Symmetry: D2
Subunit: 296 residues, 4 copies
């Protein structure tokens, strides 16, 4: 269902700090027409932390409605509050999302029993497929392979993992412990290539917001086993993958989009800021030039 | 205003998962009568992450009402959403809190510019004193000393720090950069003794929920400069400090209070769980009995 | 020159704690005849830390003489003492080694200028090609890509890197900064597969000591672009890669060899010990059974 | 036997890269006359890693000879090679050292069983008191409290710890597990103050090489229980402690001694370098002048 290049969509805002619905719809349309194979609205790159409950639901509804069955929609239903995660997940199901992205809880640092209770509670409350989002660079705690495999064995609707660790030996461990039917998606753009050769089938991507066509061509080459061409694409994309997280990626991505001439405002929500250092903007501009996408 | 032993209060719940208002009031009154010098409602140990906005506000209101001016109240007023932080902060001010505890944002990892924007926006929105809560073991990012000093220099109501790093060299750096008038409180029970000799004047404490009298005695000895006596208390308390975070301290504290005969249910909100391993309960019971806390 | 599967050779010892020269020769012969493409004597897996200067030179001499030009020999010349590294490197050159493996200095933690001085001093003292061995899990410090690229640009005989980080995004960075002529070898068995698709051409391997034929077949499949078959080999080898570093790999490898019936004693040198936990030996035995190599 | 301020002595070298025996003797005599209470020759700050066996021995012999029983001498006698450690330890005993400093092995990462074998073999080979030097920021592995206690319980001449973690909670854990008779010395200048209030009785110090009198005064105030006075010294010394490890402290200490007019050359052995950035020298000079150390 989910494969190849899947943007973790930004959430654009107006000058007045409302959801810029027309910008969001346009970005989704453009993503689909440039070759993105799926959509993740209201994830981390979507600024889930600074959306109200209502706005989070609106972002998911609007992504589901816009996509209109053309590509599958994996709605962000992440929080560190299990009851709220259930409510987000049930809203996503009822509005027509195809799957759920559920982050390992951050900040309050549950132990293994707490992870089983969190993901089990969600799995019991919805019938949609659930993807575990493992990102210890943000959550501190990391779901281990034994816990992942136990969840996969216990609950039919826990089907996959967004693996943002960038440690691809884990892709092999997860493939052996959970089975080759388990859907593994990279959550780290710069190691997505190696992640797929170890068993992954796609990438939930920051850079795809900015360069959807080349990211789609990159993932197509991997799926066809043209790993020579995929490396050629890797070498062209890697400087952009890296430039987009010199400073926080949500600000960096929106800057890159405006420099491409897209209808996306620079506005982000505190504690994120839109101001980038001169050297950061130049690193992004040169990485975009290097993929032609700008100057050539 | 804030000094010696200050519990980061638990938020007790009923078997029906409502706020146990009677248990909360009794806990505060017991804490005061045993020597706690101040109160922090709706912090991390207070399960702020699993409280709704209205419950969080109600916990703060109740704590202010119950303290009745006997001890100062530092309300938890911080999330990783600046607008929500301002809303919790302004509620706390209008209901009569004496100060605010504002955590460095977790999960979404702002950069230094974002920290200045976050803490600056909160400081401009209230007139109450603000304490920066630095806990990188939960937030991943760490506010550095230059940023902390800039905030103190820029905003007159940014007045202190909850320093939960456990790296007491930072106490010396913050004392020099921010001034000896900057109020430093330990956020790490096990290193609170050294923290104070480096410049701190108290501890926002997990263990004080369980053992408020001995924790108050420990801090009193420190403020009297009886460091020999403070080290004897340290040796009695350290095993309990340590046993309470074998598993998440929220669950462990409520287990301990229940065992001591306090009217506190075991209930916690997912992803916390109340089930503890037997080896964990055994370690807690041994540390409680070494101190001599069972009335029976 | 160096490609595919290259064992970091163990150094066998007799009951009496001398170098077991006949065992070493036999292990080398067996490695070559099973398909290993190169040899690294007196590296980390070779217990370089507990060899005398004389014994280190003897191990390199004996590996060079045994190999007799059939496969290339990359001699360990690593220490955290630059003068001693020069002496080891010059001995290796004079005895007929084909290249040098030079670890980033451990324990004394030089800064970037110190790394330039260390690797530059060695590059000036020999004409052999030098491979940088980056392993911060043992050295704490990590050579960054700018430093690596500067060394490669400055000195003709710094030609490659043993990259033991297991973070394969670095393979892409090193490929772009140092050029595709730069020889990158994985130093992490479990991520070797993804490391090669990102630009690597081989692996300096622990597991190859134990399963040289399958490791050689694994690397052959990668070099032929049969990444489907390589993944099949990965899934068979990964449990053995992981089982060999539950406890220190030098002890684990020698245990595995004796369980295969090879003439290798269990003896290691303090502070390493030969005693393995029951659960460790069983994890290794099952991983060997899973590659048939034992039971079938 | 060991208490208050104990420099980890630098090893000065000549322009020809020989041991500057005259400079070393003058440094020791100056350290004693300024209040240092003991001496550690041929430790980390003494560039043990770049000394030959015969130079290391000569540094220890000279330090013992020069101290002339006025202050005790704790010889560096530890590498990551147990047999070499025994040889350095036995030399130190036979030349008249009072105790031994034995680092947890670096680079080759023994497990707990290996630590027991390492420290046990050394303890059985000498009758001198042994101090465990725990410095995971250099060794990666960290001796845990259970292992330390087992060693103290098993070997009567394992008597104390050099604890360079900077995590003073470990001081409380070691005091409880090993006994209040276990001698704890800080290995981290910046946290030495809190370390002592948690149970320590002195500091094996980098900064004491540069500022031995004020460091001795600082430690004297602590042992007198004048913690208010100790905090005033902390505030004066902390900027110097910090400035001396902007770049490797070996280079920074010799730079500072040279600037103060001591007969100590700048020479260091690769991979250390004597060249410091101007911003580093400026920070050191400012911290030296804040204390008032320039005679001119």
């Amino acid at each position: 269902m989910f494969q190849r290049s899947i943007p973790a969509l930004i959430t654009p805002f107006t000058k007045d700090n409302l959801i810029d619905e027309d910008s969001f719809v346009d970005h989704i349309e453009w993503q689909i027409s440039e070759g993105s194979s799926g959509l993740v609205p209201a994830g981390t790159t979507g600024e889930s932390s600074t959306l109200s409950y209502e706005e989070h639901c609106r972002v998911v509804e609007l992504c589901v409605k816009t996509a209109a069955g053309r590509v599958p929609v994996m709605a962000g239903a992440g929080s560190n509050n299990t009851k709220e995660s259930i409510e987000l997940a049930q809203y996503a199901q009822n509005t027509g999302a195809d799957a759920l992205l559920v982050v390992v809880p951050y900040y309050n640092k549950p132990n293994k029993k707490g992870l089983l209770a969190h993901f089990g509670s969600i799995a019991n409350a919805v019938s949609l497929p659930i993807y575990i989002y493992n990102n210890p660079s943000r959550t501190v705690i990391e779901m281990d392979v034994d816990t992942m495999a136990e969840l996969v064995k216990t609950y039919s609707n826990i089907v996959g993992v967004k693996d943002a660790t960038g440690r691809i030996e884990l892709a092999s461990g997860q493939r052996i412990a959970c089975g080759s039917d388990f859907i593994q998606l990279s959550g780290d753009d710069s190691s997505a290539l190696g992640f797929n050769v170890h068993g992954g089938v796609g990438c939930i991507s920051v850079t795809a917001n900015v360069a959807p066509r080349i990211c789609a061509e990159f993932q197509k080459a991997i799926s066809e086993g043209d790993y020579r061409q995929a490396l050629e694409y890797q070498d062209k994309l890697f400087p952009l993958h890296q430039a987009l997280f010199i400073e926080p990626s949500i600000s960096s991505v929106k800057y890159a989009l405006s420099r491409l001439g897209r209808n996306v405002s620079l506005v982000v929500r505190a504690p994120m800021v839109s101001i980038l250092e001169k050297e950061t903007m130049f690193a992004i501009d040169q990485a975009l030039d290097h993929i032609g996408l700008c100057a050539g």
